[PDB]
Paper text:
The deposition of H3K36me3 occurs co-transcriptionally when the methyltransferase SETD2 associates with RNA polymerase II. The deposition of H3K36me3 is carried out by the conserved histone methyltransferase SETD251. Here we present three cryo-EM structures of SETD2 bound to RNA polymerase II elongation complexes at different states of nucleosome passage. Together with functional probing, our results suggest a 3-step mechanism of transcription-coupled H3K36me3 deposition.
We reconstituted the methylation-competent elongation complex on a ligated nucleosome template that would represent transcription to bp 159 of a Widom 601 sequence, such that the nucleosome is located upstream of Pol II. Focused 3D classification of the upstream region resulted in a 4.8 Å reconstruction of the catalytic SET domain (residues 1452–1696) bound to the nucleosome that we refer to as State 2. Compared to the upstream hexasome observed in State 1, in State 2 the catalytic SET domain now binds to the proximal H3 tail at SHL − 1. In contrast to previous structures of catalytic SET domains bound to nucleosomes, in State 2 the CTD of SPT16 (residues 937-951) stabilizes the SETD2-bound partially unwrapped nucleosome. Although this region of SPT16 is known to bind free H2A–H2B dimers, we observe this interaction in the context of a complete nucleosome. This interaction represents a late stage of nucleosome reassembly after FACT deposits the remaining H2A–H2B dimer, prior to complete dissociation. Applying a Gaussian filter to the nucleosome reconstruction allowed further tracing of the DNA, providing an estimate of Pol II direction, and confirming SETD2 is bound to the proximal H3 histone (relative to Pol II). Surprisingly, adjacent to the catalytic SET domain, above SHL − 1, we identified globular density in our cryo-EM map. There are only 20 unstructured amino acids between the last modeled residue of the SET domain and the beginning of the helical AID, therefore we assumed this density corresponds to the AID. Deposition of the final H2A–H2B dimer allows FACT dissociation from the nucleosome dyad and allows the SET domain to methylate the proximal H3 tail.
Author numbering:
A (entry chain c): 12 to 118
B (entry chain d): 32 to 123
C (entry chain j): 937 to 951
D (entry chain O): 1452 to 1696
E (entry chain f), H (entry chain b): 24 to 101
F (entry chain e): 40 to 134
G (entry chain a): 34 to 134
I (entry chain g): 16 to 118
Write the structure that this text describes.
DNA sequence: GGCCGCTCAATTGGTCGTAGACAGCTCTAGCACCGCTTAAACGCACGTACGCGCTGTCCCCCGCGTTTTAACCGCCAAGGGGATTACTCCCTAGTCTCCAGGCACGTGTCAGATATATACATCGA
DNA sequence: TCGATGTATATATCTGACACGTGCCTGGAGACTAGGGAGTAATCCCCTTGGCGGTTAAAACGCGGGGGACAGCGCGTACGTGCGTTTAAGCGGTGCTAGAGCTGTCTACGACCAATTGAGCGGCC
């Protein structure tokens, strides 16, 4: 027969395509799912994941750490204005808040 | 029973954006919640767009519109480019 | 004097 | 009651026992109608939010639409649509509920008014009744009264386009004198989408006391009307030395 | 009577994380009331989801769905 | 040696904002959930992570409320928060 | 010869009347043509040569007026809370910030 | 600059409907900015729905959907 | 006879059932789901209309207009909570003045 | 399509001596569609979280108790139960 | 004005398949309970920072007054664009077959938590 | 000018969470077809953009003056800070059995859909 590589490889993505395709068909979002919807969606999800991890890794360096912890994700999200507006009503477990004191409280 | 996740994929992306940086199980759990949440929002919006236009198929075009409606500012521009680029490489 | 309202906002008619 | 008999009044007026005759009218009359603004429907819209008094509260004598009446606070009288209906105490002008007053001949200022009974503070006295004129009719009557050489003037500025003239027709309020230290004041009350002016006490006014308010008189005449209020704060002339158009 | 179990220092520390420099002595009862109301709403929804699945135990997903519904969307519990 | 009133407050703000722990004790909160839940369904049971999640949400919600309450106290040209400040914040948020 | 003038309305008392008048009525508070031009002008920054229905512009007007009404209702509470009556820009900024914008 | 078209008394009138007794003189420029931003968000989404529908006209449903997404459902234009 | 008569309702059952299957809510729809949903929708409509009619009478009007729906929805503790994030066209607000603003 | 024809029937049953304008009818049309989508969307979530493929009366009841406030939910649930009872007999 | 038909969609009986309810069972997990540690919460004393009510002032926005301007009415016209019938041809769901990517469990190890003095930043007199 | 306590700091210790590893299911990939969704042409028509004249209301504008936004202050309560004492939250540990999660079988429920039928709109007489 013929070999079989994964659609993620064909698309040049690291996030899965087959899994995204199954969730759309088995999640009752529509009667039919196009053959470009999962590829495009997987790429967008992967890009969003890379965009947040980039900021998370930088936050880890600022705190002189090697692993990413919930606090780093919280710092990364709340310090970037575009992600902030996207996740402005999301609570992250064990994440805390940003160091922030109003200018009238200290002499 | 075997259970669904995104940990291995988030790890693979992490290894690309930062070759020498780890991630804890709590953070990975947050990432799984984030991937599922964005997926539910985009798919839900694409479903809403397909239903408003009396269509039955959700295609890359609907996802593109949902993504442009859901992501604020320049973040949408980069996302849209990444999606189009991925679809192009998938077609060739 | 309230019939004047019909000119500004008409009654729904089922037939 | 002296004004209720036209014959006795007219003869007493010739004898100087009473002021000259005018048509006694119970409310302001417009000589010419004006473009009905969208606000005319206020007869309907000014629904107060007062609690409809129960049979118990009303039997006890409680004051329907009292001092806390949301319309009263805005100087608007209730219409027939008010929640308290005929029990509503905020329909004074419409129900002609004026105070008890007497017309007196003063020693040196001419005719004046005095309170007949003790009047509590912030209590309504009388409506300024007369004929509503526009700028052209107002100037025409000014040109006539100037031709007739009238000493007294009865023009009251109702709104931007409306002056009430009590020279030929009106009521007893036209005899209230000017004081620089007054005991009563005017208020632009709203009644059925129509504007009215009424006199109100600023403090308790005992019986026999002369009634006076600040005219803020727009002196247009060439000559100057002398002020006779006697108070140390007397402006010397109604409207002072400053002559306006 | 467990609402008094949310101690004065606990409310103080939450306010401190929020950036509050000084707290008056009437804030504690109000905060207890607010927390009680918040928990009542979230728990009501979580319990309703629990009853539907024919289960006696409130899982973390049940609380997550209740928080998602009310527009909090807690991440970290699946 | 004593600190001027307010200095330790500012110091506490820094350590708690710098830290990532929970501020309410676990057992008191754990009983509170069980009591409030009893009115909706008698004889319930909870997973450990489930009670933790309610605590995460409760503390995040209160912190969120206090940050916004603080803006109201500051806006009123005050520093001390008062119950009316919380009431204003909840009324503007839409509760 | 002079025209006496009655006492002017105490300031703000007319404002209260306007509050009642507008709160009682249900009508558009913004001029329709100026609003329609505003909708078109900003829309040109997103897509050139667009076209609007009349019901669409009405909807945008209802939402925009309702949004400002909601904003002012919440901001008024802030001005009152600051022991003030006049509304200031800082009050609107506070209201938007607490609301979450 | 049609933003100047949202006249001084119109902004006053909206504040009156909101129950405001007295308005400062700096409220107008702030409200103009706020209104422009609000409309920009709603229009951007409505126009996006229109472009997706292959149309050129913005229907009332497009505005209702954009408003629904913003989280302010509007009744009457359905 | 129609299913609405069997349920003793006024709202349609066919249309509700049709929308559920056609609007992609699940793969299957049961038999009591549309009936129950129709009854709930009808009850909510009846509750709204009841308060609307009362608001019309207290304003001495005989036709329900958007303002009457607004008064009905906002003068109830729970309907306000259900429609707290909803705007009604030509609806207006509830007349109200804060107590520090009255003279 | 709209729900106007059905809204009339319900309106006369709570108030015989009343009418309704086209704008009010339009509002009611939006209200019915909104509550229908909220309940159906919530029922969809309930079915999906439980890995179910069928929305049943039970699903709707759970969604309704979640979406509506307390006292109102009690009345709504009572009407729903009564309707399904007459429908199944 | 009222009766016969159409277009649409609502309802029925049946076949058909497979989603779900019952019933059994396993073992994860929550629960109740004990005893000690040791950090936290509590009650009080103290004095300072602050919330507050009063006060005098300035300036700011109001109500009022008049003019300037373009927003509504309305009617009429051109045609851009939206809504809607047929054709077809492309894409997607579905059912089968096969195999390797991804998940659960299983060592081993190394980054952060613990432990301490060092040395520097910050706040009090 | 300079008391005194915390944080970041460097060093090593210590340990359980990470992360890399093997095993081997199950779900993704390739592949075929039949089917119908929607891409498209082709047409129609209806509201939309656009025109103008014309009215009169609202908006713009300019003013006096008095309300309130505001700064500054004196008072005194009340909250922060620090302590010594009290206690229960926390941990590690015990053992029980509720019930969560699962697999299996079979019953009935719903999709499908052909056929059966009326509702509501409409034209024809």
């Amino acid at each position: 027969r013929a070999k079989a590589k994964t659609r993620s490889s064909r698309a040049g993505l690291q996030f899965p395509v087959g899994r995204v395709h199954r969730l759309l068909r088995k999640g009752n979002y529509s009667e039919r799912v196009g053959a470009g919807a999962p590829v495009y969606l997987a790429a967008v999800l992967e890009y969003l994941t890379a965009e947040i991890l980039e900021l998370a890794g930088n936050a880890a360096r600022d705190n002189k750490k090697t692993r990413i912890i919930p606090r780093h994700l919280q710092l990364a999200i709340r310090n970037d204005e575009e992600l902030n507006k996207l996740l402005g009503r999301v609570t992250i477990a064990q994440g805390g808040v940003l160091p922030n004191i109003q200018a009238v409280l200290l002499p | 029973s075997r259970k669904e996740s995104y940990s291995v994929y988030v790890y693979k992306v992490l290894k690309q954006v930062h070759p020498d940086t780890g991630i804890s199980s709590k953070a990975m759990g947050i990432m799984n919640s984030f991937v599922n949440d964005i997926f539910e929002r985009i798919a839900g919006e694409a479903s809403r767009l397909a239903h408003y236009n009396k269509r039955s198929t959700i295609t890359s075009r609907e996802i593109q519109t949902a993504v442009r409606l859901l992501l604020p500012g320049e973040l949408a521009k980069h996302a849209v480019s990444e999606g189009t680029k991925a679809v192009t490489k998938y077609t060739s | 004097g309230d019939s004047e309202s019909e000119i500004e906002d008409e009654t729904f008619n089922p037939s | 009651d002296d004004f209720r008999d036209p014959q006795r009044w007219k003869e007493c007026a010739k004898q100087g026992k009473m002021p000259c005759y005018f048509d006694l009218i119970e409310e302001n009359v417009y000589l010419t109608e004006r473009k009905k603004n969208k606000s005319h429907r206020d007869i309907k819209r000014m629904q107060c939010e007062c609690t409809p008094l129960s049979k118990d509260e009303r039997a006890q004598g409680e004051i329907a639409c009292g001092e806390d009446c949301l319309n009263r606070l805005l100087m608007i009288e209730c219409s027939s649509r008010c929640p308290n209906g005929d029990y509503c105490s905020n329909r004074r002008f419409q129900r002609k509920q004026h105070a008890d007053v007497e017309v007196i001949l003063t020693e040196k200022k001419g005719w004046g008014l005095r309170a007949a009974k003790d009047l509590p503070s912030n209590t309504f006295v009388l409506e300024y009744c007369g004929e509503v004129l526009d700028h052209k009719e107002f100037k025409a009557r000014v040109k006539e009264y100037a031709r007739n050489k009238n000493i007294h003037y009865y023009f009251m500025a109702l709104k931007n386009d409306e002056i009430i003239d009590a020279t030929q027709k009106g009521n007893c309020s036209r005899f209230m004198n000017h004081s620089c230290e007054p005991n009563c004041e005017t208020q632009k009350w709203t009644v059925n989408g129509q504007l009215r002016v009424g006199f109100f006490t600023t403090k308790l006014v005992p019986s026999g006391s002369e009634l006076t308010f600040d005219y803020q008189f727009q002196r247009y005449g060439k000559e100057a009307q002398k002020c006779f209020c006697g108070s140390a704060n007397c402006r010397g002339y109604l409207g002072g030395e400053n002559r306006v158009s | 009577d467990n609402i008094q179990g949310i101690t004065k220092p606990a409310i103080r520390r939450l306010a401190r994380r929020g950036g509050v420099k000084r707290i008056s002595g009437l804030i504690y009862e109000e905060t207890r009331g607010v927390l009680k109301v918040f928990l009542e709403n979230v728990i009501r929804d979580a319990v309703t989801y629990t009853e539907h699945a024919k289960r006696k135990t409130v899982t973390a997903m049940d609380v997550v769905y209740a928080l998602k519904r009310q527009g909090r969307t807690l991440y970290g519990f699946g | 040696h004593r600190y001027r009133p307010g200095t330790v407050a500012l110091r506490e703000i820094r350590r708690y904002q710098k830290s990532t722990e929970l501020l309410i004790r676990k057992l008191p909160f754990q009983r509170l959930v069980r009591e409030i839940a009893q009115d909706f369904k008698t004889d319930l049971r909870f997973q450990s992570s489930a009670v933790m999640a309610l605590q995460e949400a409760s503390e995040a919600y209160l912190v969120g409320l206090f940050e916004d309450t603080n803006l109201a106290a500051i806006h009123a040209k005050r520093v001390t928060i008062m119950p009316k400040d919380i009431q204003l914040a909840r009324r503007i948020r839409g509760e």
